[PDB]
Amino acid sequence: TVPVKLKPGMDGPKVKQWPLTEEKIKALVEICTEMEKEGKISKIGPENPYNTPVFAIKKKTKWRKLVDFRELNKRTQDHPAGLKKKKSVTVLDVGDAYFSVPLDEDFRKYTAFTIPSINNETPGIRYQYNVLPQGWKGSPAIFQSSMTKILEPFRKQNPDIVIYQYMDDLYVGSDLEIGQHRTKIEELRQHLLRELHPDKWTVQPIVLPEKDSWTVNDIQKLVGKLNWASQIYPGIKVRQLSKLLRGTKALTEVIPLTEEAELELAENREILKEPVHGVYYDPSKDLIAEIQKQGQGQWTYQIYQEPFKNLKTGKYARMHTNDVKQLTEAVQKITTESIVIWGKTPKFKLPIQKETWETWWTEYWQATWIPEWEFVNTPPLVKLWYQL
Amino acid sequence: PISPIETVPVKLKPGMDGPKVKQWPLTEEKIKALVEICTEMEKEGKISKIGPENPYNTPVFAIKKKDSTKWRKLVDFRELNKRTQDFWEVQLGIPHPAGLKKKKSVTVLDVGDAYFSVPLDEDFRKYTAFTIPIRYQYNVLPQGWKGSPAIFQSSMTKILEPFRKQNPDIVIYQYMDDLYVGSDLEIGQHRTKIEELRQHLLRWGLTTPDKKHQKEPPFLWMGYELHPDKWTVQPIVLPEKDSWTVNDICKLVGKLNWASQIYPGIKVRQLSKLLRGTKALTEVIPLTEEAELELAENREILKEPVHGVYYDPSKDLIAEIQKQGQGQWTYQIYQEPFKNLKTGKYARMRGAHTNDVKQLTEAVQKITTESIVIWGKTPKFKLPIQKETWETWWTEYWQATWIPEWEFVNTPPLVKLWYQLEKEPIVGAETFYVDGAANRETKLGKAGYVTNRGRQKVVTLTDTTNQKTELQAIYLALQDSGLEVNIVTDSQYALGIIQAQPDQSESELVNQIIEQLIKKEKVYLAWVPAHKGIGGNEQVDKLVS
DNA sequence: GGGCGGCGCCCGAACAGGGACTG
DNA sequence: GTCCCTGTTCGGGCGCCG
Numbered sequence: 001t002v003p004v005k006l007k008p009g010m011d012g013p014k015v016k017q018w019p020l021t022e023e024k025i026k027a028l029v030e031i032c033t034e035m036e037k038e039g040k041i042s043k044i045g046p047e048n049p050y051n052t053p054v055f056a057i058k059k060k061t062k063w064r065k066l067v068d069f070r071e072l073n074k075r076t077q078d079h080p081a082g083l084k085k086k087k088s089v090t091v092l093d094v095g096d097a098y099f100s101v102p103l104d105e106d107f108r109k110y111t112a113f114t115i116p117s118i119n120n121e122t123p124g125i126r127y128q129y130n131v132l133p134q135g136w137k138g139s140p141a142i143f144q145s146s147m148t149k150i151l152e153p154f155r156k157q158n159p160d161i162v163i164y165q166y167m168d169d170l171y172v173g174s175d176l177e178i179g180q181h182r183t184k185i186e187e188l189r190q191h192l193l194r195e196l197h198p199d200k201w202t203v204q205p206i207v208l209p210e211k212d213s214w215t216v217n218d219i220q221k222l223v224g225k226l227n228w229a230s231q232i233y234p235g236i237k238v239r240q241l242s243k244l245l246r247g248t249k250a251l252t253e254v255i256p257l258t259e260e261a262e263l264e265l266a267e268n269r270e271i272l273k274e275p276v277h278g279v280y281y282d283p284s285k286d287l288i289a290e291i292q293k294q295g296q297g298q299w300t301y302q303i304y305q306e307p308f309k310n311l312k313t314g315k316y317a318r319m320h321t322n323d324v325k326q327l328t329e330a331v332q333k334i335t336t337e338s339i340v341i342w343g344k345t346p347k348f349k350l351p352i353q354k355e356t357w358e359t360w361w362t363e364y365w366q367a368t369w370i371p372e373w374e375f376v377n378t379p380p381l382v383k384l385w386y387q388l
Numbered sequence: 389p390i391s392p393i394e395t396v397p398v399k400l401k402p403g404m405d406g407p408k409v410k411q412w413p414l415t416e417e418k419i420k421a422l423v424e425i426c427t428e429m430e431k432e433g434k435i436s437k438i439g440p441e442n443p444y445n446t447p448v449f450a451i452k453k454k455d456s457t458k459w460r461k462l463v464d465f466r467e468l469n470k471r472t473q474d475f476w477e478v479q480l481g482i483p484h485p486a487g488l489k490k491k492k493s494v495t496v497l498d499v500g501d502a503y504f505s506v507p508l509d510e511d512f513r514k515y516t517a518f519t520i521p522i523r524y525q526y527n528v529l530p531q532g533w534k535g536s537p538a539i540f541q542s543s544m545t546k547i548l549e550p551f552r553k554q555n556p557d558i559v560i561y562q563y564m565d566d567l568y569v570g571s572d573l574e575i576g577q578h579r580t581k582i583e584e585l586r587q588h589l590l591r592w593g594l595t596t597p598d599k600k601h602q603k604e605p606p607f608l609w610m611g612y613e614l615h616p617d618k619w620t621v622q623p624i625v626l627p628e629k630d631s632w633t634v635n636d637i638c639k640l641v642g643k644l645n646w647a648s649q650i651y652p653g654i655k656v657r658q659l660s661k662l663l664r665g666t667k668a669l670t671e672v673i674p675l676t677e678e679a680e681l682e683l684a685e686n687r688e689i690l691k692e693p694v695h696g697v698y699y700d701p702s703k704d705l706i707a708e709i710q711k712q713g714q715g716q717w718t719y720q721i722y723q724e725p726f727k728n729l730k731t732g733k734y735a736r737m738r739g740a741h742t743n744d745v746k747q748l749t750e751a752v753q754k755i756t757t758e759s760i761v762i763w764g765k766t767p768k769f770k771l772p773i774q775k776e777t778w779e780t781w782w783t784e785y786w787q788a789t790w791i792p793e794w795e796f797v798n799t800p801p802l803v804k805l806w807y808q809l810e811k812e813p814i815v816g817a818e819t820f821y822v823d824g825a826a827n828r829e830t831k832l833g834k835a836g837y838v839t840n841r842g843r844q845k846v847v848t849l850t851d852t853t854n855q856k857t858e859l860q861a862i863y864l865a866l867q868d869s870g871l872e873v874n875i876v877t878d879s880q881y882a883l884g885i886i887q888a889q890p891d892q893s894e895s896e897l898v899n900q901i902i903e904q905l906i907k908k909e910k911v912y913l914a915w916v917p918a919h920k921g922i923g924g925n926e927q928v929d930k931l932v933s
Numbered sequence: 934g935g936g937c938g939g940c941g942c943c944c945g946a947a948c949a950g951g952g953a954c955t956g
Numbered sequence: 957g958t959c960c961c962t963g964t965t966c967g968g969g970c971g972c973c974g
């Protein structure tokens with residue numbers, strides 16, 4: 001094995017386990033019985049002071065155990081540009097390959113987790129890992145050499161195919177037709193015994209209303225929106241539009257746009273088409289992803305690292321709906337895009353109450369990773385700024 | 389005897405040693421109890437005599453057990469607890485009788501001298517030194533040490549594991565040493581299985597004395613009385629004093645909270661409000677008239693007989709919620725119409741400003757989590773809120789909010805939003821431009837408005853803030869306007885507060901604003917960026933400055 | 934009379950994040 | 957930045973169980 005240490009001056013995770021439903025607990029009990037009978041995990045006691053929450057997800061009657069290693073990954077010692085330009089990209093779960101490499105003995109105490117019981121019939125049953133656990137930052141790092149030795153022949157025989165690895169997944173991108181793309185994916189699945197479309201992702205720009213008649217209210221709202229947007233695009237000018245609002249007028253009074261204000265509005269429409277200047281991706285800083293609920297199944301999002309220096313802006317437009325489910329789906333979509341583009345997941349500012357999210361988010365999760373997030377009492381102003 | 393189970397290896401915190409506390413004086417009766425206990429335990433090898441090679445010590449004492457004349461031996465291990473490593477507790481919660489399923493046969497038994505049967509790590513025994521007014525050390529788990537509950541619970545789980553494997557269809561609710569054992573066997577086969585379980589435990593050094601072997605209902609378990617088809621809570625005696633201290637209030641509120649699991653309608657908010665800023669426990673707190681009435685209502689509802697039923701997994705879980713004032717809610721979880729699994733309250737005040745839809749959503753979340761714990765699934769909800777009210781709220785609310793499968797119930801008081809902000813400006817409504825300024829040095833401020841019809845007003849304020857002056861300006865516009873009004877505000881603080889449609893607030897100013905808003909017919913609230921020369925916000929800004 | 938752990942409730946203290954402000 | 961406001965978490969009291 002290889003020795004793995006924590007970051008200097010940091011202890012292991014001590015995160016309490018959250019309530020699980022009966023089906024998840026049963027799936028976890030079966031999976032852990034198999035893993036224990038195969039030597040992957042071992043029962044432990046309370047003299048280990050560490051813990052990491054665990055749950056399960058059902059994709060497409062086969063359950064998958066998912067361990068929330070966010071804290072442990074955060075406390076553990078420390079990219080193809082063409083992947084985002086491929087016609088088709090398939091995601092493949094390769095986590096099982098980690099169960100063949102043993103884990104450093106002194107590190108195993110940090111991977112502890114606790115299976116709960118319905119109605120607290122029984123105290124929590126605690127395990128620790130004996131092998132590279134799925135969802136841990138160290139697993140792809142320590143397995144990298146074996147993975148490269150595995151994937152060398154398939155890359156040689158297919159130089160135009162882009163295979164990139166994030167924690168538990170291989171992203172395989174090709175430019176050829178669907179049907180042959182699935183054939184190459186099946187060939188790679190054969191080789192591993194030793195559906196996205198990134199070129200269609202679009203940016204959602206800021207757009208100004210088009211009217212034949214403008215009230216004092218319309219112009220005040222437009223001026224506020226442009227004053228906000230000028231923090232991102234310094235070319236935005238507001239003087240001539242604000243001229244039309246001198247005095248103390250009624251909100252429903254109709255204001256005719258002068259030639260100066262019309263030209264200024266056209267210039268501002270043109271300026272909002274150019275890309276933001278001076279936005280450089282910092283690998284040492286975190287990706288911040290903000291989401292706004294626009295209503296009627298619409299969601300806007302921005303990915304940035306510094307204020308007003310957006311790396312990306314986009315939307316997720318669903319159509320008796322469920323806000324929490326749509327929000328988790330939007331989070332997973334944004335995270336997939338961020339992984340494909342920059343090879344890293346963003347920290348989310350979620351417009352939802354903490355308890356609602358933590359109560360219902362695991363019922364709609366389908367990915368093998370979990371991003372960091374925090375909860376926001378969002379302002380309606382920024383919600384109006386990115387409206388469509 | 390002593391369990392032949394392997395010990396759990398514990399260690400002191402790095403760079404620390406064992407405690408050296410001196411024994412405090414004890415009553416001769418306590419001394420006799422302790423010497424009898426210690427002679428008995430030393431004969432069995434649970435404690436070992438030590439000598440001068442042991443430099444540590446920790447005080448001991450004894451209390452009266454729940455039984456008639458038995459004494460429990462305790463050690464004030466607070467120092468050793470400070471010096472001892474951290475553990476991860478394995479007790480994740482408390483089992484509830486509403487989560488039990490119907491069993492043909494039930495037994496309740498209790499392990500005798502539970503802690504004193506589980507061995508202690510040899511290397512650690514040194515630190516458990518004590519003196520009976522003879523010095524000893526512990527070879528088993530002592531009572532008073534912080535690592536004893538978790539070590540015992542884990543050891544008990546390991547001991548029961550082979551029996552649970554061999555008997556997957558015998559259900560064993562294992563709270564610390566109390567075991568509830570349920571089966572679908574006839575009574576004879578059930579007693580045979582119980583004897584098998586007792587012999588299994590005895591093989592692992594855990595006796596099950598007959599004096600605590602319950603074989604017929606009602607079973608006393610976890611503070612409940614379990615009958616075949618029903619369960620009740622052992623009686624709750626609420627204090628009936630004439631003078632009320634803070635400690636008495638805490639005891640009464642705790643008893644009422646414990647009662648609310650099966651008694652519907654319990655309310656504690658007005659009694660809890662009596663505990664703001666009180667210094668110590670002995671502080672006498674005269675009861676408020678509202679607190680008096682709340683206590684009287686609770687006392688009356690506690691006089692009625694009530695019981696629960698057990699869980700049938702082949703039927704739906706239904707949680708029905710009812711509203712009372714002051715931000716308080718009750719709920720009943722049942723499967724058959726008038727047969728409650730359990731009941732509960734919810735009274736948390738989340739945030740400086742809120743309304744009843746937010747509180748209903750929060751109560752739904754709490755009930756959902758509690759139900760996931762107790763039954764492992766989410767219930768179907770009956771809520772006193774129109775589908776149209778919820779549609780409006782979650783359509784117009786900027787946050788992601790969702791209620792699981794629910795249906796409307798016709799029981800007042802219905803949950804409603806008390807006013808609606810317009811989406812568009814109002815024709816024929818006077819347009820108020822409001823603003824407030826505050827001096828961060830003198831704390832003096834001004835609030836005021838101008839209107840498109842020529843009116844302007846400015847109010848001076850003392851000991852205020854910028855946010856407060858903005859709220860005051862909005863309030864002044866609401867006061868001096870007609871039934872329909874357009875208001876253009878400077879402050880996204882006040883706009884964000886009002887757009888959430890609060891009906892209740894801890895701020896008196898926001899409460900007055902809410903009153904005004906409810907009185908109005910149409911309100912449209914718009915925002916403009918400050919200090920940008922946008923009329924007539926320009927005029928108000930110049931005025932209040 | 935006290936010691937221990939779990940869960941619950943409520944309240945206050947400490948701390949974090951964001952917006953408005955001076956000059 | 958400072959001041960103000962709001963939200964979270966954690967620790968203290970009590971209750972319940974062992």
Ligand SMILES: Nc1nc(=O)n([C@@H]2CS[C@H](COP(=O)(O)OP(=O)(O)OP(=O)(O)O)O2)cc1F
Binds near residue numbers: 454
């Ligand atoms: N107040 C208590 N403090 C404790 O530390 N305990 C611990 C945790 S559970 C364990 C039970 O111990 P025992 O079996 O010796 O005592 P018991 O009265 O529960 O039963 P029994 O007299 O041995 O039949 O003692 C129990 C208490 F009630």
Ligand SMILES: [Mg+2]
Binds near residue numbers: 498499500565
């Ligand atoms: Mg006992």
Ligand SMILES: [Mg+2]
Binds near residue numbers: 823824858878879918
């Ligand atoms: Mg202002």
